[PDB]
Amino acid sequence: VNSFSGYLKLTDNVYIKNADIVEEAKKVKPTVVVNAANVYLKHGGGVAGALNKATNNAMQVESDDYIATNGPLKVGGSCVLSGHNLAKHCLHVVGPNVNKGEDIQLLKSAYENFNQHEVLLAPLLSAGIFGADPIHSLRVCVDTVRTNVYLAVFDKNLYDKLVSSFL
Numbered sequence: 001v002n003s004f005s006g007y008l009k010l011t012d013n014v015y016i017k018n019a020d021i022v023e024e025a026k027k028v029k030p031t032v033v034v035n036a037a038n039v040y041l042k043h044g045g046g047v048a049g050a051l052n053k054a055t056n057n058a059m060q061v062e063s064d065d066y067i068a069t070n071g072p073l074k075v076g077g078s079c080v081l082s083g084h085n086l087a088k089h090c091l092h093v094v095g096p097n098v099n100k101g102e103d104i105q106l107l108k109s110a111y112e113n114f115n116q117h118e119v120l121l122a123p124l125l126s127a128g129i130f131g132a133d134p135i136h137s138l139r140v141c142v143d144t145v146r147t148n149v150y151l152a153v154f155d156k157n158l159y160d161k162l163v164s165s166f167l
């Protein structure tokens with residue numbers, strides 16, 4: 001038993017809700033919140049900009065030190081950093097950005113990072129400003145993630161479309 005509430009159950013291990021990942025995180029304090037990161041951990045907009053703002057820019061400060069030490073992530077890769085006031089940990093995952101021409105097949109590699117964590121609150125990778133089809137992203141999530149994932153979908157219209165079209 002865990003503290004997530006109001007989710008619809010899609011599969012054995014995948015759950016979905018129309019919600020603000022920022023407010024969902026501050027209420028739940030999940031062990032892991034997933035950020036829709038880029039390779040530079042520049043948290044300027046979308047989910048990343050929202051999460052970073054909610055941390056009072058502490059996420060960005062920590063991320064800049066990470067990059068200065070380690071260099072950029074790979075597309076499809078991830079790193080674990082602090083969750084600040086939102087979660088114990090933040091798993092920064094780089095899905096391919098279609099608006100940069102990145103290969104959508106790396107979306108499966110991106111979701112594989114979730115399997116290193118037993119339970120996660122997450123957005124749909126490569127959705128929103130990353131330019132992928134959120135319905136494809138949901139299918140890849142369901143077919144790749146085996147751990148327990150709670151997906152927060154900000155847009156109510158999109159949430160209803162994801163549920164109604166789910167096979």
Ligand SMILES: Nc1nc(N)c2ncn(Cc3csc(C4CC4)n3)c2n1
Nearest residue numbers: 021036046047127128129130152154
């Ligand atoms: N659940 C939730 N909460 C927010 N506050 C929010 N903002 C943008 N998106 C959609 C989204 C999913 S992946 C993504 C980035 C790759 C660009 N953007 C949001 N989803």
